[PDB]
Amino acid sequence: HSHMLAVVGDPDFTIGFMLAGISDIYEVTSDEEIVKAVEDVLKRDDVGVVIMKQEYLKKLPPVLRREIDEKVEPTFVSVG
Amino acid sequence: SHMLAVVGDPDFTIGFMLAGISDIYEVTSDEEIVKAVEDVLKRDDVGVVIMKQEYLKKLPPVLRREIDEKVEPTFVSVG
């Protein structure tokens, strides 16, 4: 039971958040890396919210998309 | 100037005001929602707008696809 804020994205997308003191970030580039990160963030029990590019869901297999569709917790926030 | 604006009911927008954000559009009725989004898209100093995911369907496809570009501002939807 913890509600950490995690961010997932390329290094250019992450810096703004790190400088802002957000250390729960997942650096990502490879399509495979995007999907694992999301799998990983879902395996966690301390994440409450996760920021992401709106252009990342498409890259996630049907299972994951619906898996995060429920979105009981963490609440996904997608940067348009 | 790239101001952060937030659109939502007072309960959703309270954690933001407490955190310093003061560019809030307090909306409740389906009607006020569409206006807010229109107003914010009518401004020239808004770089980002936070808003619940459940607010897009409530938008006329013209508008829903006006943020098609999403050039500036960028929209951030909370699921």
UniProtKB/Swiss-Prot annotation, chain B:
This entry's Gene Ontology molecular function terms read:
ATP binding; proton-transporting ATP synthase activity, rotational mechanism; proton-transporting ATPase activity, rotational mechanism
Which domain of life does this protein belong to? Archaea
Any GO BP: proton motive force-driven plasma membrane ATP synthesis
Name the keywords, alphabetized: ATP synthesis, Cell membrane, Hydrogen ion transport, Ion transport, Membrane, Transport
Would I find Ion transport among this entry's keywords? Answer: yes
Tell me the membrane topology, using the record's own terms: Peripheral membrane protein
* GO CC terms in record: plasma membrane
What does the UniProt entry say about where the protein is found?
Cell membrane
Q: What is its main location?
A: membrane
Please give the subunit comment from the record.
Has multiple subunits with at least A(3), B(3), C, D, E, F, H, I and proteolipid K(x).
- Member of which family? Belongs to the V-ATPase F subunit family.
Q: Describe its function.
A: Component of the A-type ATP synthase that produces ATP from ADP in the presence of a proton gradient across the membrane.
**Name of the featured protein:** A-type ATP synthase subunit F
Its source organism is Archaeoglobus fulgidus (strain ATCC 49558 / DSM 4304 / JCM 9628 / NBRC 100126 / VC-16)
Output the lineage of the source organism: Archaea, Methanobacteriati, Methanobacteriota, Archaeoglobi, Archaeoglobales
Q: Which residues of the full protein are shown?
A: 4 to 79 of 101
